[PDB]
């Protein structure tokens, strides 16, 4: 999917923002954690739209948020 | 442990005074959760808005959640 412009993000409803950001976040997370990509994307969609949008423009920040999300899920695993 | 900060004191303190007051009380609570990394975790909390750091002193569950989140941010910053 082509990137969302900053002008489109401010023009979308919260429902439209979630669908547009969620589809692009899922594809990028799928390249890092394919099995937990739907679960991690749902965690990302709880952030503010501006915060989730920065993940689509900074690869290094997206990797750290995925690593952070995996660590939080691992922390709750009473292994 | 220090006595809790009242909401009226927080609004009357300067930004530097808020850091000292919140930082001392946040450190004592985080120390009971992560004693070794408590100073670094407290510094991460002091970058939040004063109202948000104050809620961590009044909500135990959210405090534990933010510490776990802060610990996971530190793990993500590993060079190796």
Numbering used by the authors:
A (entry chain B): 482 to 560
B (entry chain A): 481 to 560
Reported in the publication:
NMR and X-ray crystallography reveal that Leishmania has a unique type of N-terminally-extended cap-binding protein (eIF4E4) that binds via a PAM2 motif to PABP1. Exceptionally, therefore, by binding tightly to two protein ligands and to the mRNA 5′ cap4 structure, the trypanosomatid N-terminally extended form of eIF4E acts as the core molecular scaffold for the mRNA-cap-binding complex. Thus, in Leishmania, the chain of interactions 5′cap4-eIF4E4–PABP1-poly(A) bridges the mRNA 5′ and 3′ ends. Finally, the eIF4E4 N-terminal extension is an intrinsically disordered region that transitions to a partly folded form upon binding to PABP1, whereby this interaction is not modulated by poly(A) binding to PABP1.
In further work, we were able to solve the crystal structures of PABP1(J) and of PABP1(J) co-crystallized with a synthetic eIF4E4 PAM2 peptide, both to a resolution of ∼2 Å. Obtaining these structures enabled us to locate the binding motif for eIF4E4 in relation to the three-dimensional structure of Leishmania PABP1. Consistent with the structures of other analogous complexes, binding is associated with relatively minor changes in the conformation of the PABP1 fragment; the side chains of only Lys 520 and Glu 527 are affected. Our results suggest that the changes in the roles of the respective translation factors in Leishmania have created a biomolecular chain that functions without poly(A)-mediated modulation of protein-protein interactions. This outcome is consistent with the observation that the PABP1 PABC domain forms a stable fold in solution that is only minimally altered by binding of the eIF4E4 peptide. The 1H–15N-HSQC NMR spectra showed PABP1(J) to be folded, while eIF4E4(iv) displayed amide resonance chemical shift dispersion characteristic of an intrinsically disordered domain.
